[PDB]
Amino acid sequence: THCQENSETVALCTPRIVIGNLPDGLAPGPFHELRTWEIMEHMRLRPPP
Amino acid sequence: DRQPLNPANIEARHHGVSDVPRLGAMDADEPLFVDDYRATDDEWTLQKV
Amino acid sequence: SLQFIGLQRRDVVALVNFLRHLTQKPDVDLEAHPKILKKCGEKRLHRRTVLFNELMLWLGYYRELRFHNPDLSSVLEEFEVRCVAVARRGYTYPFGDRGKARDHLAVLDRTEFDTDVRHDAEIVERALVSAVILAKMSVRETLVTAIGQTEPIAFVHLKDTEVQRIEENLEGVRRNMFCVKPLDLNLDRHANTALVNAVNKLVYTGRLIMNVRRSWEELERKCLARIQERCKLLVKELRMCLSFDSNYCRNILKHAVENGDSADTLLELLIEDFDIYVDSFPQS
Amino acid sequence: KRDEKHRHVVNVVLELPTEISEATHPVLATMLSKYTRMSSLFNDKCAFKLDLLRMVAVSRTRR
């Protein structure tokens, strides 16, 4: 991002600590639901209790 | 009655304050009697819904 | 007329005399005049009575401070004609970057009024910022360029004695906003461009308008908020003792006072049938 | 007379019966002072009657 600091414009860089922080256009909610079922199927939780 | 209502043409109610003139002006046209509460936007949309 | 409970007649008429003295006196507010607050008498009478008396005092104070609030149209027309003259002078002035100069000149051109006090303050502030930026471009002294840090309001290129006099008179306007003295006028044309003199006169008139309007806004805010607080606490005290007179008093007090017409309506409602709810109040 | 106006109100206007009056009713006693000051509106009896109804309502309310 670009940010304002004392009347001047500075650029900001900071890491996305987690995968969900990615934009929805590049990481939509339905894709995360499908990946969550992926993790569930790995852990034999495909039908949850 | 025939004209847009100006603020002076609108009257506020006095519930339980013995409004003899208001009870005499019940079915007249010109003055409009209202409660002092004004509907908010969310309540407005819910009423319309 | 104002009538309240459990107080000697001489001090009531003295308080009325004080309110009649109002517009002639400096720093006019109950905040700056504790003598009127202490006249309500902490440790003079019971609680509900002192709250009622304070509410009545504040409500009459709001009534008259609304009544005396000036219609600034007389000096506002002077502001408008100064705007016209400033726009003409900037029209003839030979700026280098004529585009933005013409844009701000048109913004000054549009500034005519719409007889709403808050719209009054907004448009006079807009006229002031456009006049200041045009003046700064004319003298070519630097000007703001950053986002969200828009042009300030300042008397450009004037001497120190003039700005000191202006600041003193501006604080005087703040303290007593009812009577206004637009007499800080000694701009001379043997120094600085005539555009700078015109815009400085415009800035003076606009600062006068802004300061007086915002002072009245502060007074109205504090008066209505304290009215609300005193009314709510009085209702809280009255809720303890159910009775016909108590219920009537709570009903008349229940009105949400956040508008001037509401305050006047509550004043008339309280005054008209004072004989009814006075039964519930003990005189100490 | 004051009694003349009070009787005029409580019979012609309020249409109250004989068994109820300001002597026994404390709520009617205070309101009768206000109603006499309403010189006009005596032709609208029902408004006064309804007003008395809501006044005796607010007299006994618990909230």
Short mmCIF file of C-alpha atoms in Angstrom, two decimals:
data_model
loop_
_atom_site.label_atom_id
_atom_site.label_comp_id
_atom_site.label_asym_id
_atom_site.label_seq_id
_atom_site.Cartn_x
_atom_site.Cartn_y
_atom_site.Cartn_z
CA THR A 1 0.00 0.00 0.00
CA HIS A 2 0.90 3.67 -0.22
CA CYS A 3 0.50 5.71 2.94
CA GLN A 4 0.63 9.36 3.97
CA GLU A 5 3.19 10.37 6.59
CA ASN A 6 3.69 14.03 7.59
CA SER A 7 2.45 15.45 4.28
CA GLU A 8 4.55 12.95 2.31
CA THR A 9 3.68 9.67 0.60
CA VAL A 10 5.53 6.53 1.70
CA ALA A 11 5.18 2.95 0.48
CA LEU A 12 4.42 0.11 2.89
CA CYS A 13 5.33 -3.56 2.63
CA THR A 14 4.28 -6.14 5.21
CA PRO A 15 3.83 -9.93 5.04
CA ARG A 16 0.53 -11.81 4.81
CA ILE A 17 0.99 -13.96 7.91
CA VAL A 18 -1.84 -16.34 6.95
CA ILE A 19 -3.24 -17.69 3.69
CA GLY A 20 -6.69 -16.20 4.26
CA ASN A 21 -5.26 -12.68 4.04
CA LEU A 22 -5.14 -13.01 0.22
CA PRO A 23 -7.83 -11.10 -1.72
CA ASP A 24 -11.12 -12.88 -2.36
CA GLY A 25 -10.63 -12.42 -6.11
CA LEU A 26 -7.43 -14.45 -5.80
CA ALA A 27 -8.57 -16.74 -2.93
CA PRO A 28 -12.38 -16.96 -2.73
CA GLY A 29 -14.42 -18.27 0.17
CA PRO A 30 -15.75 -21.31 -1.71
CA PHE A 31 -12.16 -22.32 -2.51
CA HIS A 32 -11.34 -22.19 1.20
CA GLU A 33 -14.43 -24.29 1.94
CA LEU A 34 -13.25 -26.88 -0.58
CA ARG A 35 -9.74 -26.82 0.90
CA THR A 36 -11.24 -27.21 4.37
CA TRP A 37 -13.06 -30.35 3.20
CA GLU A 38 -9.68 -31.42 1.77
CA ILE A 39 -8.09 -31.12 5.21
CA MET A 40 -11.10 -32.92 6.72
CA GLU A 41 -10.81 -35.82 4.26
CA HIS A 42 -7.11 -36.10 5.10
CA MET A 43 -7.92 -36.28 8.83
CA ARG A 44 -10.85 -38.69 8.24
CA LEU A 45 -13.28 -35.98 9.36
CA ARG A 46 -15.14 -35.80 6.02
CA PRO A 47 -18.48 -36.37 7.77
CA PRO A 48 -18.00 -34.25 10.90
CA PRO A 49 -19.57 -35.48 14.16
CA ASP B 1 -54.74 20.39 3.29
CA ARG B 2 -53.47 22.09 0.12
CA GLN B 3 -49.90 23.27 0.82
CA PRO B 4 -46.55 21.72 1.80
CA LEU B 5 -46.28 21.56 5.58
CA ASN B 6 -43.92 24.10 7.10
CA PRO B 7 -42.38 23.32 10.52
CA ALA B 8 -44.62 25.92 12.18
CA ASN B 9 -47.67 24.03 10.87
CA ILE B 10 -46.61 20.85 12.74
CA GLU B 11 -47.44 20.37 16.42
CA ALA B 12 -46.02 17.98 19.02
CA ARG B 13 -48.29 15.86 21.20
CA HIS B 14 -48.53 16.02 25.00
CA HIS B 15 -49.74 12.60 26.12
CA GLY B 16 -51.50 12.82 29.48
CA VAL B 17 -51.02 16.59 29.78
CA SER B 18 -54.70 17.53 29.32
CA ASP B 19 -54.57 18.83 25.74
CA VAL B 20 -58.05 20.37 25.64
CA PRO B 21 -57.24 22.47 22.52
CA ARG B 22 -55.74 19.45 20.74
CA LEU B 23 -58.75 17.28 21.60
CA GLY B 24 -60.89 20.11 20.25
CA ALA B 25 -58.82 20.18 17.04
CA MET B 26 -59.09 16.39 16.51
CA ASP B 27 -60.67 16.17 13.04
CA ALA B 28 -59.42 19.48 11.60
CA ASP B 29 -57.14 19.56 8.57
CA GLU B 30 -54.49 22.28 8.91
CA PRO B 31 -52.43 21.33 12.00
CA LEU B 32 -50.62 17.99 12.14
CA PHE B 33 -49.98 16.40 15.54
CA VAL B 34 -46.98 14.09 15.96
CA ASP B 35 -45.01 12.33 18.64
CA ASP B 36 -41.63 13.88 19.39
CA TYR B 37 -39.85 10.66 18.41
CA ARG B 38 -38.54 10.51 14.84
CA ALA B 39 -38.21 7.18 13.04
CA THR B 40 -34.66 6.06 12.28
CA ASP B 41 -33.38 4.78 8.95
CA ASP B 42 -33.23 1.10 9.95
CA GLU B 43 -36.75 1.25 11.39
CA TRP B 44 -37.87 3.09 8.24
CA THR B 45 -36.53 0.33 5.99
CA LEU B 46 -38.04 -2.35 8.23
CA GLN B 47 -41.43 -0.60 8.14
CA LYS B 48 -41.27 -0.42 4.35
CA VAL B 49 -40.30 -4.10 4.29
CA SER C 1 -42.66 34.59 32.72
CA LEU C 2 -40.22 32.39 34.64
CA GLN C 3 -41.54 31.00 37.91
CA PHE C 4 -39.76 28.48 40.13
CA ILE C 5 -40.17 27.03 43.59
CA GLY C 6 -38.85 27.75 47.07
CA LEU C 7 -36.78 30.89 46.49
CA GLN C 8 -37.11 34.39 47.94
CA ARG C 9 -38.73 36.87 45.56
CA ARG C 10 -35.91 39.43 45.73
CA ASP C 11 -33.28 37.02 44.40
CA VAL C 12 -35.69 35.88 41.65
CA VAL C 13 -36.16 39.45 40.45
CA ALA C 14 -32.40 40.00 40.77
CA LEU C 15 -31.77 37.00 38.51
CA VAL C 16 -34.33 38.38 36.06
CA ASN C 17 -32.43 41.69 36.16
CA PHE C 18 -29.19 39.82 35.40
CA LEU C 19 -30.78 38.19 32.35
CA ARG C 20 -32.01 41.65 31.32
CA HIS C 21 -28.41 42.92 31.60
CA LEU C 22 -27.22 40.03 29.42
CA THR C 23 -26.21 41.51 26.06
CA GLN C 24 -24.15 44.31 27.64
CA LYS C 25 -21.89 42.00 29.63
CA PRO C 26 -18.59 40.26 28.78
CA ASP C 27 -18.00 36.50 28.65
CA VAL C 28 -21.73 35.84 28.68
CA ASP C 29 -22.41 32.25 29.74
CA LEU C 30 -23.49 30.38 32.85
CA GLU C 31 -20.14 28.57 32.67
CA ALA C 32 -18.31 31.89 33.13
CA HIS C 33 -20.87 33.22 35.64
CA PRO C 34 -20.95 30.74 38.56
CA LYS C 35 -22.72 33.35 40.70
CA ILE C 36 -25.97 32.44 38.94
CA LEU C 37 -25.28 28.73 39.46
CA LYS C 38 -24.63 29.18 43.18
CA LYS C 39 -27.73 31.37 43.43
CA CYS C 40 -29.69 28.15 42.87
CA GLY C 41 -28.58 27.34 46.42
CA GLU C 42 -26.71 24.14 47.16
CA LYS C 43 -27.82 23.48 50.77
CA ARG C 44 -30.78 25.87 50.50
CA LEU C 45 -33.70 23.56 49.61
CA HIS C 46 -34.58 19.99 48.71
CA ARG C 47 -33.18 18.17 45.69
CA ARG C 48 -36.06 18.10 43.20
CA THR C 49 -36.71 21.80 43.83
CA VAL C 50 -33.12 22.84 43.09
CA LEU C 51 -33.07 20.68 39.95
CA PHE C 52 -36.36 22.23 38.80
CA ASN C 53 -35.06 25.74 39.50
CA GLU C 54 -31.82 25.09 37.61
CA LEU C 55 -33.78 23.61 34.69
CA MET C 56 -36.08 26.64 34.57
CA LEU C 57 -33.10 29.02 34.67
CA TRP C 58 -31.29 27.17 31.87
CA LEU C 59 -34.47 26.97 29.78
CA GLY C 60 -35.19 30.69 30.02
CA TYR C 61 -31.51 31.30 29.27
CA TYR C 62 -31.82 29.19 26.12
CA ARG C 63 -34.99 31.05 25.12
CA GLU C 64 -33.39 34.48 25.30
CA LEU C 65 -30.03 33.38 23.85
CA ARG C 66 -32.00 32.06 20.89
CA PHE C 67 -33.96 35.31 20.68
CA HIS C 68 -30.94 37.63 20.72
CA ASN C 69 -28.95 35.56 18.19
CA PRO C 70 -28.11 38.13 15.49
CA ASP C 71 -29.18 38.00 11.85
CA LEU C 72 -25.76 38.70 10.34
CA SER C 73 -27.23 39.63 6.92
CA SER C 74 -26.00 43.22 7.31
CA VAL C 75 -22.30 42.30 7.43
CA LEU C 76 -22.97 39.18 5.34
CA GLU C 77 -23.88 41.40 2.39
CA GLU C 78 -20.57 43.20 2.96
CA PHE C 79 -18.89 39.78 2.79
CA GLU C 80 -20.71 39.06 -0.48
CA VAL C 81 -19.66 42.34 -2.10
CA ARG C 82 -16.08 41.77 -0.91
CA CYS C 83 -16.26 38.33 -2.54
CA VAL C 84 -17.42 39.96 -5.79
CA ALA C 85 -14.60 42.52 -5.67
CA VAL C 86 -11.99 39.84 -4.88
CA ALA C 87 -13.23 37.72 -7.78
CA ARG C 88 -13.04 40.70 -10.15
CA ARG C 89 -9.50 41.55 -9.01
CA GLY C 90 -8.36 37.94 -9.39
CA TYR C 91 -10.00 37.92 -12.82
CA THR C 92 -7.84 40.85 -13.91
CA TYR C 93 -4.72 39.64 -12.09
CA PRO C 94 -1.95 38.16 -14.31
CA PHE C 95 -1.38 34.73 -12.78
CA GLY C 96 1.03 32.37 -14.51
CA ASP C 97 -0.88 29.10 -14.05
CA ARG C 98 -4.21 30.63 -15.04
CA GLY C 99 -6.18 27.37 -14.91
CA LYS C 100 -6.22 26.71 -11.17
CA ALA C 101 -6.48 30.45 -10.52
CA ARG C 102 -9.65 30.56 -12.64
CA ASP C 103 -10.97 27.46 -10.88
CA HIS C 104 -10.58 28.98 -7.41
CA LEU C 105 -11.95 32.28 -8.74
CA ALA C 106 -15.10 30.47 -9.86
CA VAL C 107 -15.29 28.80 -6.44
CA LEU C 108 -15.29 32.31 -4.96
CA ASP C 109 -17.92 33.27 -7.55
CA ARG C 110 -20.30 30.54 -6.38
CA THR C 111 -20.22 31.42 -2.66
CA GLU C 112 -23.57 33.29 -2.38
CA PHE C 113 -25.66 32.39 0.62
CA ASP C 114 -28.74 30.31 1.48
CA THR C 115 -29.86 31.68 4.91
CA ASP C 116 -29.02 28.53 6.89
CA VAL C 117 -26.58 29.16 9.73
CA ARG C 118 -24.52 25.98 9.36
CA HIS C 119 -24.59 26.29 5.58
CA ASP C 120 -23.63 29.92 6.25
CA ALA C 121 -20.50 28.80 8.12
CA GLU C 122 -19.58 26.13 5.56
CA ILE C 123 -19.81 28.46 2.56
CA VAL C 124 -18.00 31.32 4.31
CA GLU C 125 -15.19 28.88 5.18
CA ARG C 126 -15.03 27.77 1.53
CA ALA C 127 -14.84 31.39 0.38
CA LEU C 128 -12.06 32.00 2.90
CA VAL C 129 -9.95 29.05 1.76
CA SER C 130 -10.30 29.99 -1.91
CA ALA C 131 -9.41 33.63 -1.19
CA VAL C 132 -6.37 32.55 0.84
CA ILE C 133 -5.05 30.23 -1.87
CA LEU C 134 -5.53 32.90 -4.55
CA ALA C 135 -3.69 35.42 -2.36
CA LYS C 136 -0.84 32.96 -1.78
CA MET C 137 -0.53 32.35 -5.51
CA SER C 138 -0.58 36.11 -6.18
CA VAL C 139 2.23 36.86 -3.72
CA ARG C 140 3.75 33.52 -4.89
CA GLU C 141 4.55 32.57 -1.29
CA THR C 142 4.43 28.80 -0.92
CA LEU C 143 1.17 26.87 -0.53
CA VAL C 144 0.05 23.42 0.56
CA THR C 145 0.35 20.44 -1.79
CA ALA C 146 -0.36 17.37 0.37
CA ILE C 147 -3.52 15.26 0.38
CA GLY C 148 -5.93 16.01 3.20
CA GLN C 149 -3.88 18.96 4.52
CA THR C 150 -5.89 21.65 2.73
CA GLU C 151 -5.27 25.43 2.76
CA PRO C 152 -5.35 27.23 6.12
CA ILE C 153 -6.99 30.56 6.97
CA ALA C 154 -4.43 33.31 7.59
CA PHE C 155 -3.95 37.06 7.24
CA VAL C 156 -1.29 37.13 4.53
CA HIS C 157 1.61 39.60 4.51
CA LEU C 158 0.05 41.92 7.10
CA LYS C 159 2.06 43.57 9.86
CA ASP C 160 2.34 42.25 13.42
CA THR C 161 0.41 45.08 15.10
CA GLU C 162 -2.58 44.51 12.81
CA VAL C 163 -2.69 40.77 13.51
CA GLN C 164 -2.35 41.38 17.26
CA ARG C 165 -5.27 43.83 17.15
CA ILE C 166 -7.27 41.37 15.03
CA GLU C 167 -6.63 38.52 17.46
CA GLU C 168 -7.64 40.61 20.48
CA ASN C 169 -10.87 41.70 18.79
CA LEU C 170 -11.52 38.10 17.70
CA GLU C 171 -11.24 36.85 21.28
CA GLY C 172 -13.57 39.67 22.29
CA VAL C 173 -16.02 38.46 19.64
CA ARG C 174 -15.73 34.92 21.05
CA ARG C 175 -16.45 36.01 24.62
CA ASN C 176 -19.50 38.18 23.78
CA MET C 177 -20.88 37.10 20.39
CA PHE C 178 -24.15 39.05 20.56
CA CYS C 179 -22.69 42.52 19.88
CA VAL C 180 -20.11 42.52 17.07
CA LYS C 181 -17.57 45.25 16.24
CA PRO C 182 -16.21 45.00 12.67
CA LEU C 183 -13.86 47.97 13.15
CA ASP C 184 -10.39 46.45 12.63
CA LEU C 185 -10.01 48.21 9.26
CA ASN C 186 -6.83 50.10 8.41
CA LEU C 187 -5.63 48.34 5.26
CA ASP C 188 -3.37 50.59 3.17
CA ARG C 189 -2.53 50.46 -0.54
CA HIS C 190 1.07 51.72 -0.41
CA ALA C 191 2.21 48.17 0.40
CA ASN C 192 1.27 44.76 -1.07
CA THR C 193 -0.94 44.20 -4.12
CA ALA C 194 -4.55 45.39 -4.07
CA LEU C 195 -5.63 41.76 -4.48
CA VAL C 196 -3.96 40.97 -1.15
CA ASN C 197 -5.74 43.90 0.53
CA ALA C 198 -9.11 42.82 -0.87
CA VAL C 199 -8.65 39.20 0.18
CA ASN C 200 -7.48 40.28 3.64
CA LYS C 201 -10.64 42.37 4.10
CA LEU C 202 -12.64 39.35 2.92
CA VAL C 203 -10.77 37.12 5.39
CA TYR C 204 -11.51 39.56 8.22
CA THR C 205 -15.23 39.56 7.48
CA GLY C 206 -15.29 35.78 7.06
CA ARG C 207 -13.40 35.19 10.31
CA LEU C 208 -15.87 37.45 12.11
CA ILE C 209 -18.82 35.48 10.70
CA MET C 210 -17.20 32.10 11.43
CA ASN C 211 -16.17 32.94 14.99
CA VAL C 212 -19.55 34.34 16.00
CA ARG C 213 -21.48 31.46 14.42
CA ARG C 214 -19.29 28.79 16.03
CA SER C 215 -19.50 30.55 19.40
CA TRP C 216 -23.29 30.42 19.19
CA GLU C 217 -23.04 26.75 18.20
CA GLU C 218 -20.97 26.03 21.32
CA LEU C 219 -23.43 27.91 23.53
CA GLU C 220 -26.42 26.07 22.05
CA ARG C 221 -24.72 22.67 22.39
CA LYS C 222 -23.82 23.18 26.04
CA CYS C 223 -27.21 24.70 26.94
CA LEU C 224 -29.25 21.87 25.42
CA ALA C 225 -26.96 19.14 26.78
CA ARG C 226 -27.17 20.53 30.32
CA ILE C 227 -30.94 20.92 29.92
CA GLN C 228 -31.08 17.22 29.06
CA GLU C 229 -28.93 16.22 32.04
CA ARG C 230 -30.86 18.29 34.60
CA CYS C 231 -34.18 17.04 33.20
CA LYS C 232 -33.11 13.39 33.34
CA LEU C 233 -31.84 13.66 36.92
CA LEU C 234 -35.03 15.48 37.99
CA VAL C 235 -37.10 12.71 36.38
CA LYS C 236 -34.97 10.13 38.22
CA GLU C 237 -35.73 11.85 41.53
CA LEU C 238 -39.43 12.19 40.70
CA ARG C 239 -39.83 8.51 39.74
CA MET C 240 -39.40 7.50 43.39
CA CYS C 241 -42.73 8.97 44.59
CA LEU C 242 -45.74 8.01 42.49
CA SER C 243 -48.68 10.44 42.63
CA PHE C 244 -51.03 12.27 40.29
CA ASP C 245 -49.02 15.51 40.41
CA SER C 246 -45.76 13.54 40.19
CA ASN C 247 -47.05 11.63 37.16
CA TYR C 248 -48.14 14.88 35.49
CA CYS C 249 -44.73 16.43 36.16
CA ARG C 250 -42.94 13.38 34.75
CA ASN C 251 -45.19 13.50 31.69
CA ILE C 252 -44.38 17.15 31.03
CA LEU C 253 -40.67 16.50 31.70
CA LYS C 254 -40.57 13.43 29.45
CA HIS C 255 -40.19 15.50 26.26
CA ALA C 256 -36.90 14.93 24.43
CA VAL C 257 -35.34 18.40 24.43
CA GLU C 258 -32.84 18.44 21.56
CA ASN C 259 -34.44 21.16 19.40
CA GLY C 260 -35.12 24.81 20.14
CA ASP C 261 -38.83 24.45 19.43
CA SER C 262 -38.87 21.51 21.86
CA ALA C 263 -37.24 23.69 24.53
CA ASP C 264 -39.80 26.47 24.01
CA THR C 265 -42.66 23.95 24.04
CA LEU C 266 -41.43 22.50 27.33
CA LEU C 267 -41.07 26.02 28.75
CA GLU C 268 -44.66 26.92 27.86
CA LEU C 269 -45.97 23.56 29.09
CA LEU C 270 -44.19 23.98 32.43
CA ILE C 271 -45.27 27.61 32.88
CA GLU C 272 -48.93 27.26 31.86
CA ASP C 273 -49.97 24.67 34.47
CA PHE C 274 -47.41 25.44 37.18
CA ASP C 275 -50.12 25.26 39.86
CA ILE C 276 -50.58 21.51 39.28
CA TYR C 277 -47.10 20.02 39.65
CA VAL C 278 -46.03 22.56 42.31
CA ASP C 279 -48.02 20.43 44.78
CA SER C 280 -45.38 17.67 44.57
CA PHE C 281 -42.47 19.98 45.45
CA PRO C 282 -41.70 20.86 49.08
CA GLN C 283 -40.17 24.28 49.84
CA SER C 284 -37.35 22.84 51.97
CA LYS D 1 -69.73 32.90 41.09
CA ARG D 2 -66.98 30.27 41.07
CA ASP D 3 -69.54 27.62 42.01
CA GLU D 4 -71.73 28.78 39.12
CA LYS D 5 -68.94 28.15 36.61
CA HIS D 6 -67.99 24.84 38.23
CA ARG D 7 -71.60 23.60 38.11
CA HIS D 8 -71.95 24.85 34.52
CA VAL D 9 -68.89 22.84 33.51
CA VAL D 10 -69.65 19.64 35.43
CA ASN D 11 -73.28 19.49 34.25
CA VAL D 12 -73.65 21.14 30.83
CA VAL D 13 -70.17 20.36 29.48
CA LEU D 14 -68.73 17.33 31.29
CA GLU D 15 -72.22 15.72 31.53
CA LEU D 16 -71.24 14.32 34.92
CA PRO D 17 -73.97 12.88 37.17
CA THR D 18 -74.90 14.22 40.59
CA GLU D 19 -73.22 11.46 42.62
CA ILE D 20 -69.71 12.58 41.54
CA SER D 21 -68.31 16.07 42.08
CA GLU D 22 -65.13 17.94 42.98
CA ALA D 23 -65.89 17.63 46.70
CA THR D 24 -65.28 13.87 46.67
CA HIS D 25 -62.93 13.66 43.66
CA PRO D 26 -59.43 15.10 44.21
CA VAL D 27 -58.55 14.69 40.51
CA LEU D 28 -61.56 16.75 39.41
CA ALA D 29 -60.68 19.45 41.95
CA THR D 30 -57.39 20.47 40.34
CA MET D 31 -58.50 20.08 36.71
CA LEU D 32 -61.66 22.15 37.24
CA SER D 33 -59.44 25.20 37.77
CA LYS D 34 -57.92 24.78 34.29
CA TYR D 35 -61.19 24.02 32.48
CA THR D 36 -62.88 27.20 33.72
CA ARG D 37 -60.10 29.28 32.15
CA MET D 38 -61.07 27.77 28.78
CA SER D 39 -63.70 30.39 27.99
CA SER D 40 -64.53 28.90 24.58
CA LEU D 41 -64.77 25.22 23.48
CA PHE D 42 -67.83 24.66 25.71
CA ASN D 43 -69.73 23.52 22.60
CA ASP D 44 -67.31 20.57 22.33
CA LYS D 45 -68.42 18.57 25.36
CA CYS D 46 -66.93 15.28 24.15
CA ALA D 47 -63.39 16.69 24.10
CA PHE D 48 -63.69 17.73 27.75
CA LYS D 49 -65.20 14.35 28.67
CA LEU D 50 -62.39 12.45 26.93
CA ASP D 51 -59.83 14.72 28.59
CA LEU D 52 -61.31 13.93 32.00
CA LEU D 53 -61.11 10.24 31.12
CA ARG D 54 -57.40 10.43 30.30
CA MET D 55 -56.75 12.56 33.39
CA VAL D 56 -58.36 10.00 35.69
CA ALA D 57 -56.32 7.42 33.76
CA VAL D 58 -53.01 9.17 34.46
CA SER D 59 -54.08 9.71 38.07
CA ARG D 60 -53.97 5.96 38.83
CA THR D 61 -51.15 4.79 36.53
CA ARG D 62 -48.30 2.80 38.08
CA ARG D 63 -45.50 3.62 35.62
#
